[PDB]
Design a protein around this ligand. Structure first.
Ligand SMILES: CN(CC(=O)O)NC(=O)C[C@H](N)C[C@@H](O)CNCCCN
Ligand SMILES: [Mg+2]
Ligand SMILES: [Mg+2]
Ligand SMILES: [Mg+2]
Ligand SMILES: [Mg+2]
Ligand SMILES: [Mg+2]
Ligand SMILES: [Mg+2]
Ligand SMILES: [Mg+2]
Ligand SMILES: [Mg+2]
Ligand SMILES: [Mg+2]
Ligand SMILES: [Mg+2]
Ligand SMILES: [Mg+2]
Ligand SMILES: [Mg+2]
Ligand SMILES: [Mg+2]
Ligand SMILES: [Mg+2]
Ligand SMILES: [Mg+2]
Ligand SMILES: [Mg+2]
Ligand SMILES: [Mg+2]
Lengths: 101, 127, 151, 114, 82, 99
RNA sequence: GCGGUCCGGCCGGGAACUCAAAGGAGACUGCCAGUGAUAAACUGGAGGAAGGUGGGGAUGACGUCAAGUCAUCAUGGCCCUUACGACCAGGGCUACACACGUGCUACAAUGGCGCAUACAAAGAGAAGCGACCUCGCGAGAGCAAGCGGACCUCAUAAAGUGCGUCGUAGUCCGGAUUGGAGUCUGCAACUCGACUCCAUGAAGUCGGAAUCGCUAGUAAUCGUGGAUCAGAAUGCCACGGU
């Protein structure tokens, strides 16, 4: 799916764990009300924007791991709907057989 | 002594204990007028003891689980007959012609892909 | 059907009386699976037949059913590009089915407040051989001996 | 008989007939009557001048009548003067809150013109 | 409707305004920030707002305060069908 | 104190020989066993489109079953604890111990 | 079934029953009448939970339409290469005289509203599901245990039943549209989110020619769950009630 689109996903994920899941303190408890309700929170709402436009966990598209498809994704397998069927008929997804109820 | 039966209907399951002598019907620690608000449901639990005359002649201790109102009442009627056939062994051919021994095996059909329901198909247009 | 020909399915009696023709009448009235609400209308309408116009509760429903029953009907029988309306004898299980549907469909297009009162007046009008359920029966019989020559 | 709202309500129940006043819906009508101490199954015939006049004072506290029509037309005139996005949707009869106009804008656009 | 704990503005617009206010106005101030809130500090300024291809000059009146800057630059060209 | 062992697998024949080996083996060195308990079977379901491009109504449906067995041992003698640790069963069977 | 109780399966206890999931049995025209060409086979009866492939699913023969997909992927040929490749901000895919398809909600009394009270199945959960308690009319906020789960949570099933009111009206039917005030997710809610509160209260009174689905736990009607997913279903995939 256009090689550079695969690279956008792998840069976004490296820059998000560079800053966030540690530098969430600016919104984690700086934006909730106690003695920090003065201009310090207002300094946070502005300081949270100078970190790069990436770095946020809500800009990851979650593509398929082999083909890079943006649609038809399944979080349980990490593959697109095409690749889970292509790989389930060969017996390579464990325990995943055809359901009949 | 108690004579036990198991009856089941759509998704309901009923356990039934009968003891000799009373006209007591107790179901889930409630009486019949408090448990079944529907009189059709009231009249299908009385069906097997109206064919066989043990109305003031046999007590009944009932529990039910699952399903809804009419589903639970049908599971009981099936469970009373199994209890009364352990009691006597010769009320069987009386009850087979009443259709109370057949377990009604009609279940909900699963929803199918491409269909709006189990069998309802979406609206077709020629063009 | 062509091949799978059918037995019958069984109806339960009514609880208060023990009649299945009465239970077929509740089935025909029932809308959207609401069976408890159809018995409420059917039970309340029948005793409000009884002491408003004449006793013997369920005898009064069968006698109101005696008049709206058809004996002949028309049916179309195709030949080669010409369809005649041929008068047919109606069968006794089809007699009650057409009579109960015409009573229920007469009661829906009325002007009374409730459905149990619309039912009660249409059943009362059927006992006096009046109303619209009787005239639905009259038009079927008029067309049948109008096409007597195509028998 | 009539309110500060110059309307004339009629003989329904009082919680229902107070909604005849423009600017008063269902929970203002229950709050008006709850503050007057009047039960809601009472019509307006049955209801005194000492109870119609006391109903007028608390209704006279909300912004309920043609004073509210001015404040509503104030705020539309407002948007129509800034030339903002909501003002260009208002002067055009097109839906304002971002609904679909490709199909199904028929309340805001009126009956269709070919 | 953003929640009541902080209105939003960019940093580059926030700082470019405050320097431009203490000097008299100017050129129209070029920005791409359609999402930033107009503040009380900006009454009198002219801000050229991007709309996709152009920058529409908006002279801030008092009654534009509280709105977003993108409301005063239409992004869509449309004039009739027939 | 009863030590409690839960076994998870996608296969029911593999899981029963994992129960049978720990049911074998606590009784090897003399413990109370209740035996195996069937916990409820978890079925995960999946429904995929099978065409690469359109045709919404053509699909395949897959599932994964997860079989559960529970056996508790309330004689944990010290011949048991490391003799329970020296046991080599299959690679499809997840064991989780817990007190 | 017993002992006790706070009268809660609650505690000892029991392994009976429901249930959980492994194994086994059972249905085969097996038995019997009659019909049919000493046939096959058919109609009917008994027993049985089930009777004639018991219900439902998966399973799509040789081929047809040069059917669909070079955009999931792979790949022959051709073409671009300081650009038809790569990075960034803002916009657009949501435009709007109009026409069509598939849906949702309605046009009410077999109903609307108000109070009280019953009976499900199946699914999901760790940068998640999130009880109790407190604040808020509400969406929600604070605090915050339990749960990698037959245990904890999502999570209060709705139609139903009992009582009351409305009394056939553009209505106490309908809830579109618009104004104001908010909540949450997220760098960010203007273009262009969902939801809450107050107000507003459109069309619509059963739909021309035409046309669609369904043979039984089906149609019709009523709620619940899941994937995708920070947020964002009237769609889709599942589950039960009548
Ligand atoms: C929505 N409801 C309204 C109602 O209840 O009447 N039903 C309908 O609109 C369909 C209508 N009942 C009958 C129609 O399909 C057949 N008539 C054919 C006309 C000429 N082809
Ligand atoms: Mg590639
Ligand atoms: Mg996303
Ligand atoms: Mg269903
Ligand atoms: Mg479809
Ligand atoms: Mg009003
Ligand atoms: Mg929208
Ligand atoms: Mg078995
Ligand atoms: Mg038989
Ligand atoms: Mg390019
Ligand atoms: Mg599109
Ligand atoms: Mg739009
Ligand atoms: Mg009512
Ligand atoms: Mg009307
Ligand atoms: Mg009108
Ligand atoms: Mg209303
Ligand atoms: Mg109204
Ligand atoms: Mg989501």
């Amino acid at each position: 799916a256009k090689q550079s689109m695969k690279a956008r996903e792998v840069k976004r994920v490296a820059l998000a764990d560079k800053y966030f899941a540690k530098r969430a303190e600016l919104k984690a408890i700086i934006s909730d009300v106690n003695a920090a309700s003065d201009e310090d929170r207002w300094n946070a709402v502005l300081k949270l924007q100078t970190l790069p436009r990436d770095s946020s966990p809500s800009r990851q598209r979650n593509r398929c791991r082999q083909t890079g498809r943006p649609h038809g994704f399944l979080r349980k397998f990490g593959l697109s709907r095409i690749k889970v069927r292509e790989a389930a008929m060969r017996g390579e997804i464990p325990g995943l057989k055809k359901a009949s109820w | 002594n108690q004579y036990y039966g198991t009856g089941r209907r759509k998704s309901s399951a009923a356990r039934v204990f009968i003891k000799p002598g009373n006209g007591k019907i107790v179901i889930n620690q409630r009486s019949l007028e408090q448990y079944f608000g529907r009189e059709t449901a009231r009249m299908v639990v009385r069906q097997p003891l109206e064919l066989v005359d043990m109305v003031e002649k046999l007590d009944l201790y009932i529990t039910v689980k699952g399903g809804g109102i009419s589903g639970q009442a049908g599971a009981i009627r099936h469970g009373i007959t199994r209890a009364l056939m352990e009691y006597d062994e010769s009320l069987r051919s009386e009850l087979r012609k009443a259709g109370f021994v057949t377990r009604d095996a009609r279940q909900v059909e699963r929803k199918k892909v491409g269909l709006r329901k189990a069998r309802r198909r979406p609206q077709f247009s020629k063009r | 059907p062509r091949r799978r020909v059918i037995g019958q399915r069984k109806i339960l009696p009514d609880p208060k009386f023990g009649s299945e023709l009465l239970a077929k009448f509740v089935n025909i009235l029932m809308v959207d699976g609401k069976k408890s609400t159809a018995e409420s209308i059917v039970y309340s309408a029948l005793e409000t037949l009884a002491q408003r116009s004449g006793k013997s509760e369920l005898e009064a429903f069968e006698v109101a059913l005696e008049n709206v029953r058809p004996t002949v009907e028309v049916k179309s029988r195709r030949v080669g590009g010409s369809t005649y309306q041929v008068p047919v004898e109606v069968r006794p299980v089809r007699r009650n089915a057409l009579a109960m549907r015409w009573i229920v469909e007469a009661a829906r297009k009325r002007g009374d407040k409730s459905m149990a009162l619309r039912l009660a007046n249409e059943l009362s009008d059927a006992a006096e051989n009046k109303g619209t359920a009787v005239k639905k029966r009259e038009d079927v019989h008029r067309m049948a001996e109008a096409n007597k020559a195509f028998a | 008989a009539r309110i500060a709202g110059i309307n004339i309500p009629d003989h329904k129940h009082a919680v229902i007939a107070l909604t005849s006043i423009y600017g008063v819906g269902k929970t203002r009508s229950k709050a008006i009557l709850a503050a007057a101490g009047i039960a809601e199954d009472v019509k307006i015939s049955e209801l005194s001048e000492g109870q119609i006049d006391t109903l007028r004072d608390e209704v006279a506290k909300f912004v309920v009548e043609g004073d509210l029509r001015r404040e509503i037309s104030m705020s539309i005139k407002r948007l129509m003067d800034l030339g903002c996005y909501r003002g260009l949707r208002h002067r055009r009869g097109l839906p304002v809150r971002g609904q679909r106009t490709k199909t199904n804008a028929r309340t805001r656009k009126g009956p269709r013109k070919p | 409707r953003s929640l009541k704990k902080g209105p939003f503005i960019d940093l580059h617009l926030l700082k470019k305004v405050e320097k431009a206010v203490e000097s008299g106005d100017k050129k129209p101030l070029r920005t791409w920030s359609r999402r930033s809130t107009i503040f009380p500090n900006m009454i009198g300024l002219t801000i050229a707002v991007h709309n996709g291809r152009q920058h529409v000059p908006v002279f801030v009146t008092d009654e534009m305060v509280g709105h977003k800057l993108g409301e005063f630059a239409p992004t869509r060209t449309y004039r009739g069908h027939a | 104190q009863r030590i409690r062992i839960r076994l998870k697998a996608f296969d029911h024949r593999l899981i029963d020989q994992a129960t049978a080996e720990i049911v074998e083996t606590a009784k090897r060195t003399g413990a109370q066993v209740r035996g195996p308990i069937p916990l409820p079977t978890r079925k995960e379901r999946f429904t995929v489109l099978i065409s690469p491009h359109v045709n919404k109504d053509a699909r395949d449906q897959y599932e994964i079953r997860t079989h559960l067995r529970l056996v508790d041992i309330v004689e944990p003698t010290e011949k048991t604890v490391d003799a329970l640790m020296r046991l080599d069963l299959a690679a499809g069977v997840d064991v989780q111990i817990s007190l």
